[PDB]
């Protein structure tokens, strides 16, 4: 099973 | 429910006014069933929506809630470098040595993603730089070669 990333992102832009 | 969907979307977008309209005692800890079961607090934390994070916490959002992969909102904040959000979560009692299904901690995330100040914050609150995930890697093991400062920080030297 792939460990998918957490919901979110680092840059708001 | 449509209302819960709208709330989760508002949390993600940082739409404070919509969050205030839809956040109820029953919806504050709802989960995105069609994604990875993120709560409104996961979305607000991961998308750096500080005002929403604050409002959700005040209105009873669970800082300890795990998503489908065992991530808590502190994981989201740390992976994406959101220092203020991380500090708010820790101040509200977030466990810094929390581990997901793969035994990744927030420090694994901050280290791998090159977030020095967040690593420092986590360490100040007792995060363990020696904790191995299921791959057998510590957060130090995941530091990029270029981030010599983070390496030194986690080494305690």
PDB file of C-alpha atoms in Angstrom:
ATOM      1  CA  UNK A   1       0.000   0.000   0.000  1.00  0.00           C
ATOM      2  CA  UNK A   2       1.195   3.464  -0.981  1.00  0.00           C
ATOM      3  CA  UNK A   3       1.698   5.906   1.876  1.00  0.00           C
ATOM      4  CA  UNK A   4      -0.129   8.895   0.377  1.00  0.00           C
ATOM      5  CA  UNK A   5       0.741  12.423   1.526  1.00  0.00           C
ATOM      6  CA  UNK A   6      -1.270  14.401   4.075  1.00  0.00           C
ATOM      7  CA  UNK A   7      -3.929  16.757   2.767  1.00  0.00           C
ATOM      8  CA  UNK A   8      -2.349  20.174   2.324  1.00  0.00           C
ATOM      9  CA  UNK A   9       0.439  21.997   0.505  1.00  0.00           C
ATOM     10  CA  UNK A  10       3.377  24.153   1.551  1.00  0.00           C
ATOM     11  CA  UNK A  11       2.721  27.305  -0.508  1.00  0.00           C
ATOM     12  CA  UNK A  12      -0.641  29.100  -0.477  1.00  0.00           C
ATOM     13  CA  UNK A  13       0.191  30.488  -3.948  1.00  0.00           C
TER      14      UNK A  13
ATOM     15  CA  UNK B   1     -23.771  15.093   3.931  1.00  0.00           C
ATOM     16  CA  UNK B   2     -23.700  18.136   1.659  1.00  0.00           C
ATOM     17  CA  UNK B   3     -23.241  20.379   4.717  1.00  0.00           C
ATOM     18  CA  UNK B   4     -20.201  18.428   5.902  1.00  0.00           C
ATOM     19  CA  UNK B   5     -18.741  18.508   2.389  1.00  0.00           C
ATOM     20  CA  UNK B   6     -19.174  22.276   2.307  1.00  0.00           C
ATOM     21  CA  UNK B   7     -17.551  22.587   5.739  1.00  0.00           C
ATOM     22  CA  UNK B   8     -14.526  20.531   4.714  1.00  0.00           C
ATOM     23  CA  UNK B   9     -14.178  22.619   1.557  1.00  0.00           C
ATOM     24  CA  UNK B  10     -14.412  25.836   3.577  1.00  0.00           C
ATOM     25  CA  UNK B  11     -11.754  24.616   6.006  1.00  0.00           C
ATOM     26  CA  UNK B  12      -9.437  23.781   3.093  1.00  0.00           C
ATOM     27  CA  UNK B  13     -10.026  27.167   1.448  1.00  0.00           C
ATOM     28  CA  UNK B  14      -9.676  29.219   4.635  1.00  0.00           C
ATOM     29  CA  UNK B  15     -13.232  30.530   4.210  1.00  0.00           C
ATOM     30  CA  UNK B  16     -13.755  31.576   7.820  1.00  0.00           C
ATOM     31  CA  UNK B  17     -17.292  32.879   7.362  1.00  0.00           C
ATOM     32  CA  UNK B  18     -18.544  29.627   5.823  1.00  0.00           C
ATOM     33  CA  UNK B  19     -16.790  27.622   8.545  1.00  0.00           C
ATOM     34  CA  UNK B  20     -18.609  29.702  11.160  1.00  0.00           C
ATOM     35  CA  UNK B  21     -21.939  29.044   9.464  1.00  0.00           C
ATOM     36  CA  UNK B  22     -21.493  25.277   9.104  1.00  0.00           C
ATOM     37  CA  UNK B  23     -19.427  24.340  12.155  1.00  0.00           C
ATOM     38  CA  UNK B  24     -21.750  22.592  14.624  1.00  0.00           C
ATOM     39  CA  UNK B  25     -21.082  20.304  17.582  1.00  0.00           C
ATOM     40  CA  UNK B  26     -21.913  17.469  15.185  1.00  0.00           C
ATOM     41  CA  UNK B  27     -19.823  18.591  12.196  1.00  0.00           C
ATOM     42  CA  UNK B  28     -16.669  20.012  13.790  1.00  0.00           C
ATOM     43  CA  UNK B  29     -15.032  16.575  13.733  1.00  0.00           C
ATOM     44  CA  UNK B  30     -16.566  15.225  10.525  1.00  0.00           C
ATOM     45  CA  UNK B  31     -14.399  13.312   8.039  1.00  0.00           C
ATOM     46  CA  UNK B  32     -13.840  13.433   4.287  1.00  0.00           C
ATOM     47  CA  UNK B  33     -15.152   9.977   3.444  1.00  0.00           C
ATOM     48  CA  UNK B  34     -14.335  10.267  -0.247  1.00  0.00           C
ATOM     49  CA  UNK B  35     -10.680  11.182   0.314  1.00  0.00           C
ATOM     50  CA  UNK B  36      -8.418  10.131   3.182  1.00  0.00           C
ATOM     51  CA  UNK B  37     -10.861  10.923   6.006  1.00  0.00           C
ATOM     52  CA  UNK B  38      -9.290  14.274   6.804  1.00  0.00           C
ATOM     53  CA  UNK B  39     -11.210  16.324   9.386  1.00  0.00           C
ATOM     54  CA  UNK B  40     -11.805  20.073   9.026  1.00  0.00           C
ATOM     55  CA  UNK B  41      -8.784  20.535  11.332  1.00  0.00           C
ATOM     56  CA  UNK B  42      -6.569  18.395   9.057  1.00  0.00           C
ATOM     57  CA  UNK B  43      -7.573  20.502   6.075  1.00  0.00           C
ATOM     58  CA  UNK B  44      -7.085  23.815   7.835  1.00  0.00           C
ATOM     59  CA  UNK B  45      -3.723  22.690   9.235  1.00  0.00           C
ATOM     60  CA  UNK B  46      -2.383  21.330   5.957  1.00  0.00           C
ATOM     61  CA  UNK B  47      -3.483  24.340   3.912  1.00  0.00           C
ATOM     62  CA  UNK B  48      -2.135  26.832   6.482  1.00  0.00           C
ATOM     63  CA  UNK B  49      -5.495  28.385   7.323  1.00  0.00           C
ATOM     64  CA  UNK B  50      -4.571  29.834  10.705  1.00  0.00           C
ATOM     65  CA  UNK B  51      -7.848  31.640  11.499  1.00  0.00           C
ATOM     66  CA  UNK B  52      -9.791  28.474  10.697  1.00  0.00           C
ATOM     67  CA  UNK B  53      -7.430  26.333  12.784  1.00  0.00           C
ATOM     68  CA  UNK B  54      -8.047  28.684  15.698  1.00  0.00           C
ATOM     69  CA  UNK B  55     -11.817  28.691  15.279  1.00  0.00           C
ATOM     70  CA  UNK B  56     -12.020  24.912  14.913  1.00  0.00           C
ATOM     71  CA  UNK B  57      -9.891  24.328  18.010  1.00  0.00           C
ATOM     72  CA  UNK B  58     -12.031  26.771  20.025  1.00  0.00           C
ATOM     73  CA  UNK B  59     -15.139  24.930  18.866  1.00  0.00           C
ATOM     74  CA  UNK B  60     -13.985  21.484  19.884  1.00  0.00           C
ATOM     75  CA  UNK B  61     -11.986  20.073  16.985  1.00  0.00           C
ATOM     76  CA  UNK B  62      -9.945  17.063  18.054  1.00  0.00           C
ATOM     77  CA  UNK B  63      -6.205  17.750  17.774  1.00  0.00           C
ATOM     78  CA  UNK B  64      -5.576  14.013  18.192  1.00  0.00           C
ATOM     79  CA  UNK B  65      -7.873  12.816  15.408  1.00  0.00           C
ATOM     80  CA  UNK B  66      -6.286  10.374  12.981  1.00  0.00           C
ATOM     81  CA  UNK B  67      -7.134  10.221   9.298  1.00  0.00           C
ATOM     82  CA  UNK B  68      -7.330   7.049   7.209  1.00  0.00           C
ATOM     83  CA  UNK B  69      -3.538   6.726   7.156  1.00  0.00           C
ATOM     84  CA  UNK B  70      -3.101   7.537  10.833  1.00  0.00           C
ATOM     85  CA  UNK B  71      -2.006  11.165  10.330  1.00  0.00           C
ATOM     86  CA  UNK B  72      -2.992  13.776  12.889  1.00  0.00           C
ATOM     87  CA  UNK B  73      -3.228  17.459  11.957  1.00  0.00           C
ATOM     88  CA  UNK B  74       0.267  18.003  13.401  1.00  0.00           C
ATOM     89  CA  UNK B  75       1.614  15.717  10.638  1.00  0.00           C
ATOM     90  CA  UNK B  76      -0.039  17.900   7.977  1.00  0.00           C
ATOM     91  CA  UNK B  77       1.331  21.094   9.478  1.00  0.00           C
ATOM     92  CA  UNK B  78       4.858  19.769   9.841  1.00  0.00           C
ATOM     93  CA  UNK B  79       5.077  18.160   6.411  1.00  0.00           C
ATOM     94  CA  UNK B  80       4.108  21.462   4.766  1.00  0.00           C
ATOM     95  CA  UNK B  81       6.206  23.774   6.936  1.00  0.00           C
ATOM     96  CA  UNK B  82       3.366  25.622   8.659  1.00  0.00           C
ATOM     97  CA  UNK B  83       5.126  26.715  11.832  1.00  0.00           C
ATOM     98  CA  UNK B  84       2.389  28.857  13.377  1.00  0.00           C
ATOM     99  CA  UNK B  85      -0.159  26.076  12.855  1.00  0.00           C
ATOM    100  CA  UNK B  86       2.229  23.523  14.389  1.00  0.00           C
ATOM    101  CA  UNK B  87       2.766  25.754  17.408  1.00  0.00           C
ATOM    102  CA  UNK B  88      -1.004  26.226  17.892  1.00  0.00           C
ATOM    103  CA  UNK B  89      -1.537  22.456  17.741  1.00  0.00           C
ATOM    104  CA  UNK B  90       1.254  21.706  20.205  1.00  0.00           C
ATOM    105  CA  UNK B  91       0.001  24.433  22.567  1.00  0.00           C
ATOM    106  CA  UNK B  92      -3.412  22.721  22.457  1.00  0.00           C
ATOM    107  CA  UNK B  93      -1.860  19.460  23.580  1.00  0.00           C
ATOM    108  CA  UNK B  94      -0.909  17.705  20.354  1.00  0.00           C
ATOM    109  CA  UNK B  95       1.320  14.676  21.012  1.00  0.00           C
ATOM    110  CA  UNK B  96       4.645  15.321  19.258  1.00  0.00           C
ATOM    111  CA  UNK B  97       5.700  11.662  19.162  1.00  0.00           C
ATOM    112  CA  UNK B  98       2.481  10.578  17.455  1.00  0.00           C
ATOM    113  CA  UNK B  99       2.984   7.919  14.774  1.00  0.00           C
ATOM    114  CA  UNK B 100       0.924   7.111  11.679  1.00  0.00           C
ATOM    115  CA  UNK B 101       0.208   3.620  10.291  1.00  0.00           C
ATOM    116  CA  UNK B 102       3.729   3.538   8.836  1.00  0.00           C
ATOM    117  CA  UNK B 103       5.210   4.799  12.126  1.00  0.00           C
ATOM    118  CA  UNK B 104       6.092   8.191  10.625  1.00  0.00           C
ATOM    119  CA  UNK B 105       6.113  10.955  13.244  1.00  0.00           C
ATOM    120  CA  UNK B 106       5.779  14.702  12.664  1.00  0.00           C
ATOM    121  CA  UNK B 107       9.561  14.921  13.036  1.00  0.00           C
ATOM    122  CA  UNK B 108       9.996  12.446  10.148  1.00  0.00           C
ATOM    123  CA  UNK B 109       7.853  14.811   8.081  1.00  0.00           C
ATOM    124  CA  UNK B 110       9.603  18.038   9.109  1.00  0.00           C
ATOM    125  CA  UNK B 111      13.044  16.485   8.622  1.00  0.00           C
ATOM    126  CA  UNK B 112      12.312  14.958   5.219  1.00  0.00           C
ATOM    127  CA  UNK B 113      10.800  18.227   3.990  1.00  0.00           C
ATOM    128  CA  UNK B 114      13.656  20.424   5.204  1.00  0.00           C
ATOM    129  CA  UNK B 115      11.817  22.427   7.865  1.00  0.00           C
ATOM    130  CA  UNK B 116      14.459  23.463  10.399  1.00  0.00           C
ATOM    131  CA  UNK B 117      12.380  25.692  12.704  1.00  0.00           C
ATOM    132  CA  UNK B 118       9.623  23.092  12.908  1.00  0.00           C
ATOM    133  CA  UNK B 119      12.169  20.360  13.708  1.00  0.00           C
ATOM    134  CA  UNK B 120      13.517  22.636  16.458  1.00  0.00           C
ATOM    135  CA  UNK B 121       9.999  23.225  17.828  1.00  0.00           C
ATOM    136  CA  UNK B 122       9.230  19.509  17.871  1.00  0.00           C
ATOM    137  CA  UNK B 123      12.543  18.715  19.555  1.00  0.00           C
ATOM    138  CA  UNK B 124      11.900  21.423  22.162  1.00  0.00           C
ATOM    139  CA  UNK B 125       8.703  19.559  23.012  1.00  0.00           C
ATOM    140  CA  UNK B 126      10.393  16.173  23.316  1.00  0.00           C
ATOM    141  CA  UNK B 127      10.172  14.752  19.797  1.00  0.00           C
ATOM    142  CA  UNK B 128      12.434  11.723  19.386  1.00  0.00           C
ATOM    143  CA  UNK B 129      14.960  11.989  16.533  1.00  0.00           C
ATOM    144  CA  UNK B 130      15.796   8.280  17.001  1.00  0.00           C
ATOM    145  CA  UNK B 131      12.332   6.823  16.363  1.00  0.00           C
ATOM    146  CA  UNK B 132      12.389   4.414  13.421  1.00  0.00           C
ATOM    147  CA  UNK B 133       9.448   4.247  11.021  1.00  0.00           C
ATOM    148  CA  UNK B 134       8.438   0.914   9.462  1.00  0.00           C
ATOM    149  CA  UNK B 135      11.215   1.251   6.880  1.00  0.00           C
ATOM    150  CA  UNK B 136      13.625   1.405   9.812  1.00  0.00           C
ATOM    151  CA  UNK B 137      14.442   5.047   9.130  1.00  0.00           C
ATOM    152  CA  UNK B 138      14.800   7.728  11.787  1.00  0.00           C
ATOM    153  CA  UNK B 139      13.917  11.345  11.026  1.00  0.00           C
ATOM    154  CA  UNK B 140      17.666  11.958  10.740  1.00  0.00           C
ATOM    155  CA  UNK B 141      17.844   9.230   8.070  1.00  0.00           C
ATOM    156  CA  UNK B 142      15.314  11.177   5.993  1.00  0.00           C
ATOM    157  CA  UNK B 143      17.178  14.502   5.962  1.00  0.00           C
ATOM    158  CA  UNK B 144      18.304  15.717   2.529  1.00  0.00           C
ATOM    159  CA  UNK B 145      22.082  15.837   2.057  1.00  0.00           C
ATOM    160  CA  UNK B 146      21.952  19.595   1.499  1.00  0.00           C
ATOM    161  CA  UNK B 147      20.266  20.298   4.830  1.00  0.00           C
ATOM    162  CA  UNK B 148      23.377  20.018   6.997  1.00  0.00           C
ATOM    163  CA  UNK B 149      21.811  22.319   9.596  1.00  0.00           C
ATOM    164  CA  UNK B 150      18.869  19.966  10.121  1.00  0.00           C
ATOM    165  CA  UNK B 151      21.275  17.022  10.329  1.00  0.00           C
ATOM    166  CA  UNK B 152      23.263  18.804  13.049  1.00  0.00           C
ATOM    167  CA  UNK B 153      20.052  19.765  14.856  1.00  0.00           C
ATOM    168  CA  UNK B 154      18.691  16.213  15.021  1.00  0.00           C
ATOM    169  CA  UNK B 155      22.104  14.779  15.944  1.00  0.00           C
ATOM    170  CA  UNK B 156      22.251  17.043  18.986  1.00  0.00           C
ATOM    171  CA  UNK B 157      25.612  18.143  17.636  1.00  0.00           C
TER     172      UNK B 157
END
